[PDB]
Design an enzyme around this catalytic site. Structure first.
Site, PDB file in Angstrom:
ATOM      1  N   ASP A 117     102.190  71.126  81.543  1.00 14.94           N
ATOM      2  CA  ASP A 117     102.782  72.140  80.626  1.00 14.94           C
ATOM      3  C   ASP A 117     101.762  72.392  79.514  1.00 14.94           C
ATOM      4  O   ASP A 117     101.433  71.429  78.808  1.00 14.94           O
ATOM      5  CB  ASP A 117     104.119  71.678  80.030  1.00 14.94           C
ATOM      6  CG  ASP A 117     104.757  72.686  79.089  1.00 14.94           C
ATOM      7  OD1 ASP A 117     105.020  73.823  79.546  1.00 14.94           O
ATOM      8  OD2 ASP A 117     104.954  72.340  77.900  1.00 14.94           O
ATOM      9  N   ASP A 119     101.036  73.679  76.053  1.00 18.25           N
ATOM     10  CA  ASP A 119     101.697  74.003  74.763  1.00 18.25           C
ATOM     11  C   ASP A 119     100.599  74.271  73.730  1.00 18.25           C
ATOM     12  O   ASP A 119     100.340  73.419  72.862  1.00 18.25           O
ATOM     13  CB  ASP A 119     102.690  72.915  74.378  1.00 18.25           C
ATOM     14  CG  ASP A 119     103.609  73.278  73.219  1.00 18.25           C
ATOM     15  OD1 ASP A 119     103.411  74.354  72.606  1.00 18.25           O
ATOM     16  OD2 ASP A 119     104.538  72.487  72.949  1.00 18.25           O
ATOM     17  N   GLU A 121      99.473  76.309  70.597  1.00 13.56           N
ATOM     18  CA  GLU A 121     100.131  76.929  69.411  1.00 13.56           C
ATOM     19  C   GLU A 121      99.105  77.289  68.335  1.00 13.56           C
ATOM     20  O   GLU A 121      98.841  76.481  67.456  1.00 13.56           O
ATOM     21  CB  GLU A 121     101.174  75.974  68.826  1.00 13.56           C
ATOM     22  CG  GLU A 121     102.273  75.632  69.831  1.00 13.56           C
ATOM     23  CD  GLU A 121     103.489  74.850  69.379  1.00 13.56           C
ATOM     24  OE1 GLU A 121     103.687  74.669  68.167  1.00 13.56           O
ATOM     25  OE2 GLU A 121     104.299  74.468  70.268  1.00 13.56           O
ATOM     26  N   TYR A 196     113.354  79.847  69.412  1.00 11.66           N
ATOM     27  CA  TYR A 196     113.833  79.046  68.260  1.00 11.66           C
ATOM     28  C   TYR A 196     112.701  79.000  67.224  1.00 11.66           C
ATOM     29  O   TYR A 196     111.665  79.696  67.423  1.00 11.66           O
ATOM     30  CB  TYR A 196     114.382  77.698  68.740  1.00 11.66           C
ATOM     31  CG  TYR A 196     113.485  76.887  69.643  1.00 11.66           C
ATOM     32  CD1 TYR A 196     112.272  76.399  69.181  1.00 11.66           C
ATOM     33  CD2 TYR A 196     113.863  76.546  70.939  1.00 11.66           C
ATOM     34  CE1 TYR A 196     111.443  75.635  69.988  1.00 11.66           C
ATOM     35  CE2 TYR A 196     113.046  75.780  71.753  1.00 11.66           C
ATOM     36  CZ  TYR A 196     111.838  75.307  71.271  1.00 11.66           C
ATOM     37  OH  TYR A 196     110.995  74.557  72.033  1.00 11.66           O
TER      38      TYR A 196
HETATM   39  C1  LIG Z   1     109.101  83.540  63.973  1.00 10.10           C
HETATM   40  C2  LIG Z   1     107.922  82.649  63.547  1.00 10.10           C
HETATM   41  O1  LIG Z   1     106.768  83.092  63.455  1.00 10.10           O
HETATM   42  N1  LIG Z   1     108.238  81.382  63.263  1.00 10.10           N
HETATM   43  C3  LIG Z   1     107.194  80.433  62.819  1.00 10.10           C
HETATM   44  C4  LIG Z   1     107.521  79.089  63.433  1.00 10.10           C
HETATM   45  O2  LIG Z   1     107.354  79.202  64.884  1.00 10.10           O
HETATM   46  C5  LIG Z   1     106.632  77.985  62.849  1.00 10.10           C
HETATM   47  O3  LIG Z   1     107.181  76.725  63.230  1.00 10.10           O
HETATM   48  C6  LIG Z   1     106.534  76.045  64.310  1.00 10.10           C
HETATM   49  O4  LIG Z   1     107.119  76.558  65.496  1.00 10.10           O
HETATM   50  C7  LIG Z   1     106.647  75.882  66.656  1.00 10.10           C
HETATM   51  C8  LIG Z   1     107.345  76.631  67.807  1.00 10.10           C
HETATM   52  O5  LIG Z   1     106.736  77.924  67.889  1.00 10.10           O
HETATM   53  C9  LIG Z   1     106.927  74.357  66.626  1.00 10.10           C
HETATM   54  O6  LIG Z   1     106.297  73.717  67.701  1.00 10.10           O
HETATM   55  C10 LIG Z   1     106.362  73.762  65.362  1.00 10.10           C
HETATM   56  O7  LIG Z   1     106.715  72.362  65.246  1.00 10.10           O
HETATM   57  C11 LIG Z   1     106.861  74.538  64.170  1.00 10.10           C
HETATM   58  N2  LIG Z   1     106.209  74.085  62.918  1.00 10.10           N
HETATM   59  C12 LIG Z   1     106.892  73.509  61.919  1.00 10.10           C
HETATM   60  C13 LIG Z   1     106.077  73.180  60.661  1.00 10.10           C
HETATM   61  O8  LIG Z   1     108.070  73.163  62.036  1.00 10.10           O
HETATM   62  C14 LIG Z   1     106.711  78.049  61.331  1.00 10.10           C
HETATM   63  C15 LIG Z   1     105.976  76.888  60.665  1.00 10.10           C
HETATM   64  O9  LIG Z   1     104.978  77.382  59.769  1.00 10.10           O
HETATM   65  O10 LIG Z   1     106.168  79.306  60.880  1.00 10.10           O
HETATM   66  C16 LIG Z   1     107.082  80.353  61.283  1.00 10.10           C
HETATM   67  O11 LIG Z   1     106.553  81.588  60.754  1.00 10.10           O
END
Ligand SMILES: CC(=O)N[C@@H]1[C@@H](O)[C@H](O[C@@H]2O[C@H](CO)[C@@H](O)[C@H](O)[C@H]2NC(C)=O)[C@@H](CO)O[C@H]1O
Length: 368
Positions: A117, A119, A121, A196
């Protein structure tokens, strides 16, 4: 049946959480994804020797599970929020892609996994403070995926078995702008949409982790109209992910704020005063914790937004606001999976629901 149920299991389970691969009810899933392997010098490597391949020996437990559950497929998840910094380099040249792909095959052979998988990011932009990017990531994500599919077919042919390749993709449709989902969809067995983390304590205002549809009542700054499950699914369908390969992510955790103004909406979409109470860290609650301690309990009242199709808790006394996955919202998402002919459901993560309230609903709707 037609539907997958993909459960992420976190290596950190084998610490304070005291939730080991032996605690998993394997009848409730089709796939475990092991979060995570790290990248060192361009190669897939053991993330934590203390619990993965040694010490508590999570890997030995997962192989024992495969032997007891012939249906079961276990994949190694590479990267995650914290460990995605090595992807850009790995994907950048044919030599790096081969080095990476060959290390991935070596890993799953050594530790008894049934595939990989990815992942990452995230390509081109977005990710943790330590994350690395280049513009070529858009094309290189396709090329690394192809290198892996090729390495895994060859190794599968040698080994007398089939190895799966999957990926976790952003709920933010910037991910679609920054990849070729039409191309990589032909090589991935399925695509775990992370539908999510739409709202969180990164915002000083409250909101829903995984609202089903857009709520125009929510107009806080830079929160996109597409920050919702249906928007994410339709975006990946249009980008050329086939319905049958699109797996819908569900969160088994919640986020919390403290000192949220009640306003007109019992703390929903309101200015707050930082992170709320959490389980293993501030502002992040296991579903287990919410269910035992908070759900219409100890001054936390449950409310339902019939636009977004999401439940939330508010404590008027402390102003603490919780976003979490209620069964009413999850039943709507499971119905939607079936109506759209989607690839099934994915969840982060299985240690977070010890009574299996959400785990059991997902299993009963998609597998039976
Ligand atoms: C809609 C959007 O852009 N949401 C952002 C979040 O996705 C992001 O959080 C991170 O999301 C990941 C999943 O896509 C997780 O794996 C990761 O753990 C998570 N990070 C945190 C710190 O919880 C947040 C975090 O900056 O930003 C949003 O904009």
């Amino acid at each position: 049946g037609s539907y997958r149920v993909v459960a992420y299991y976190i290596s950190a389970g084998a610490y304070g959480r005291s939730y080991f691969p032996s605690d998993i009810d394997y009848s409730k899933v089709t796939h475990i994804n092991y979060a995570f392997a790290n990248i060192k010098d361009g190669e897939v490597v053991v993330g934590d020797p203390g619990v993965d391949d040694g010490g508590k020996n999570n890997f030995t437990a997962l192989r024992k599970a495969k032997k007891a559950h012939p249906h079961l497929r276990n994949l190694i998840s590479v990267g995650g929020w914290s460990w995605s910094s090595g992807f850009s380099d790995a994907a950048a040249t044919p030599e790096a892609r081969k080095r990476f792909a060959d290390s991935a095959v070596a890993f799953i052979r050594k530790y008894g996994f049934d595939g990989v998988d990815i992942d990452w990011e995230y390509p081109v932009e977005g990710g943790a403070e330590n994350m690395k990017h280049r513009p070529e990531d858009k094309q290189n994500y396709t090329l690394l995926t192809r290198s892996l599919r090729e390495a895994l077919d060859t190794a599968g042919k040698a080994d007398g078995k089939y190895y799966e390749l999957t990926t976790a993709v952003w709920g933010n449709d910037k991910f679609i702008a920054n990849t070729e989902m039409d191309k990589v969809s032909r090589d991935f067995d399925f695509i775990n949409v992370m539908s999510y983390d739409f709202n969180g304590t990164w915002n000083k205002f409250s909101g829903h982790n995984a609202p089903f549809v857009n709520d125009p009542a929510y107009d806080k700054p830079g929160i996109g109209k597409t920050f919702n499950v249906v928007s994410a699914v339709e975006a990946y369908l249009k980008a050329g992910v086939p319905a049958d390969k699109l797996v819908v992510g569900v969160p088994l955790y919640g986020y919390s704020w403290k000192g949220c103004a009640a306003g007109e909406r019992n703390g929903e979409y309101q200015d707050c005063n930082g992170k709320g109470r959490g389980t293993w860290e501030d502002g992040n609650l296991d579903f287990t914790d919410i269910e035992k301690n908070l759900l219409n309990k100890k001054g936390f009242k449950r409310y339902w937004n019939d636009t977004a199709k999401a439940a939330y808790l508010y404590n008027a006394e402390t102003g603490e606001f919780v976003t979490y996955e209620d069964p009413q919202a999850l039943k709507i998402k499971l119905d939607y999976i079936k109506s759209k002919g989607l690839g099934g459901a994915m969840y982060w993560e299985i240690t977070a629901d010890r009574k299996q309230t959400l785990v059991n609903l997902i299993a009963d709707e998609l597998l039976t």
